[PDB]
Amino acid sequence: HMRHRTLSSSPALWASIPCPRSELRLDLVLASGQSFRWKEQSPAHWSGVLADQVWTLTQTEDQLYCTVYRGDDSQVSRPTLEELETLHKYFQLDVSLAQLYSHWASVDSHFQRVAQKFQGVRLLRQDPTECLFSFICSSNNNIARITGMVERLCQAFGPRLIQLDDVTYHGFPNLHALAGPEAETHLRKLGLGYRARYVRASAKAILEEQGGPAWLQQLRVAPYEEAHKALCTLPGVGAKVADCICLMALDKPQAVPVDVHVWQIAHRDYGWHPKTSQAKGPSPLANKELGNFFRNLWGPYAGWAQAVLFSADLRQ
Numbered sequence: 001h002m003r004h005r006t007l008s009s010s011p012a013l014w015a016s017i018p019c020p021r022s023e024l025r026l027d028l029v030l031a032s033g034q035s036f037r038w039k040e041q042s043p044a045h046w047s048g049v050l051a052d053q054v055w056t057l058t059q060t061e062d063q064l065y066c067t068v069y070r071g072d073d074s075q076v077s078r079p080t081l082e083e084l085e086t087l088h089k090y091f092q093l094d095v096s097l098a099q100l101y102s103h104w105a106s107v108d109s110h111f112q113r114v115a116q117k118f119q120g121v122r123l124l125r126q127d128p129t130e131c132l133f134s135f136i137c138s139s140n141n142n143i144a145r146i147t148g149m150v151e152r153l154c155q156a157f158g159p160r161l162i163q164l165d166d167v168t169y170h171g172f173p174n175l176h177a178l179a180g181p182e183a184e185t186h187l188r189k190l191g192l193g194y195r196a197r198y199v200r201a202s203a204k205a206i207l208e209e210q211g212g213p214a215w216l217q218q219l220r221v222a223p224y225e226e227a228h229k230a231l232c233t234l235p236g237v238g239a240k241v242a243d244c245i246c247l248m249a250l251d252k253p254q255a256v257p258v259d260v261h262v263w264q265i266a267h268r269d270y271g272w273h274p275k276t277s278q279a280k281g282p283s284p285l286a287n288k289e290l291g292n293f294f295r296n297l298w299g300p301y302a303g304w305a306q307a308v309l310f311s312a313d314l315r316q
């Protein structure tokens with residue numbers, strides 16, 4: 001039955017949030033390896049799931065337009081105020097990006113040059129659970145393939161929300177669904193390889209060892225360094241994944257995930273090499289040092305600054 005909407009087709013069903021495109025570019029944020037749940041199903045219209053509902057998003061120079069599909073048969077309508085506040089928080093639109101870009105730009109000429117072309121890169125505020133298991137799937141992987149795994153994971157273990165066209169949207173599973181005796185085998189069947197072990201084992205560990213998803217919520221109010229350390233006790237969660245989660249889901253803007261790509265950017269575009277270590281390649285200690293470097297340079301929103309560069313390095 002139900003079809004993916006565009007702003008032309010069904011304007012009655014859209015609400016808008018004042019938002020300069022220079023504070024937010026959907027095309028630089030939603031598929032730049034923060035969330036893996038957004039797809040441009042028709043041009044300049046992005047559809048994906050947010051907290052148990054499907055949205056479609058598009059924008060002009062000065063407005064962010066959105067529509068919500070509730071599925072569980074309700075009557076069709078525009079977004080409510082509450083839903084719009086959900087969306088405002090997801091894009092952390094209280095935070096001014098113009099001021100951050102200008103502050104980063106003032107100590108960093110490399111940034112200033114790349115930041116001209118790549119405005120409106122900001123950090124999503126994601127659900128901890130979805131973010132943890134998504135980034136467990138990120139090891140030795142690329143966005144396209146991670147997106148594939150996460151999709152199949154959600155279809156197989158998460159509640160069906162709605163279907164639009166040929167796309168069936170599922171909510172992100174809960175810990176208990178991922179912790180079960182078959183979960184690893186099923187996830188292997190779904191193409192996750194060794195990552196399947198870490199999904200099930202981390203689901204199991206968060207439940208039994210940490211008393212379930214309220215623990216992740218506690219980490220949101222815990223300090224960065226305590227949150228990071230705690231996450232690294234989990235199967236398949238090391239410094240990189242923990243930093244992704246910290247930055248993207250636990251409101252730690254100073255977290256800087258270091259993987260082979262941030263290594264590459266740091267060395268190529270900043271001329272950085274490990275100093276306080278001898279070993280010249282990536283290593284846990286050198287990776288830590290690189291994160292410290294960027295905090296030192298950019299300040300307590302270093303992770304946001306890094307996201308600009310990451311997002312810019314994905315486009316040629």
Ligand SMILES: Clc1ccc(Nc2ccnc3[nH]ncc23)cc1Cl
Pocket residue numbers: 032033034138139141142143146244257258259262306307310311
């Ligand atoms: Cl395969 C893959 C996909 C996405 C990411 N994501 C990031 C890593 C570091 N800093 C970031 N800032 N914003 C996104 C992002 C990593 C991998 Cl390893």
Ligand code: NI
Pocket residue numbers: 267273
């Ligand atoms: Ni060199």
